[PDB]
């Protein structure tokens, strides 16, 4: 399972209410059921260079809630 | 895109801090990359009868965050 994600050079950096550091990066999402891409932000560890990628994702369950886990280690530049 | 979800008769009902009502139902998730199923809860509108289903999901973006949207209207009993 993978999806095309067009990243940008827009990265929101800052500290959370808990004093913890976070790095949110912007990126556009492409859905087979959507004609236009959606602007989304990702909680990346390292800044990703702007460009379209085919990221292999999986459905992980955290604290009992189903969430998406994107594998940036196996993403393919589109 | 679909995934096997084994629902149960465990539904957590209650009010949120905002006084709003919520209906959380239990269900087991099946991942191709996992040998055993994971216990997960869903924010359903109506109680679903315990049983394994093949639910067609999609990746929706809310408030700029990528999340899963399960289509219980097109799920197939497994």
Curated annotation (Swiss-Prot), chains A, B:
Named from the GO MF annotations, one term is: DNA binding
User: Which domain of life does this protein belong to?
Assistant: Viruses
Keywords (A to Z) from UniProt = DNA replication, DNA-binding
- Output the GO biological process annotations, alphabetical, semicolon-separated: DNA replication
Q: Does the keyword DNA repair apply?
A: no
Against SUPFAM superfamilies, the record matches this protein to: Nucleic acid-binding proteins
Please give the InterPro entries that the UniProt record associates with this protein.
NA-bd_OB-fold (IPR012340), SS_DBP_Pseudomonas (IPR040905)
Kindly give the Gene3D superfamilies that the UniProt entry links to this protein: Nucleic acid-binding proteins
For whether the record's keyword set contains DNA-binding, the answer is: yes
Functionally, this protein is described as follows: Binds to DNA in a highly cooperative manner without pronounced sequence specificity. During synthesis of the single-stranded (progeny) viral DNA, prevents the conversion into the double-stranded replicative form. G5P is displaced by the capsid protein G8P during phage assembly on the inner bacterial membrane.
Family stated for the protein in its record = Belongs to the inovirus G5P protein family.
Share what the entry says about its subunit structure, partners included: Homodimer.
Protein name, per record: DNA-Binding protein G5P
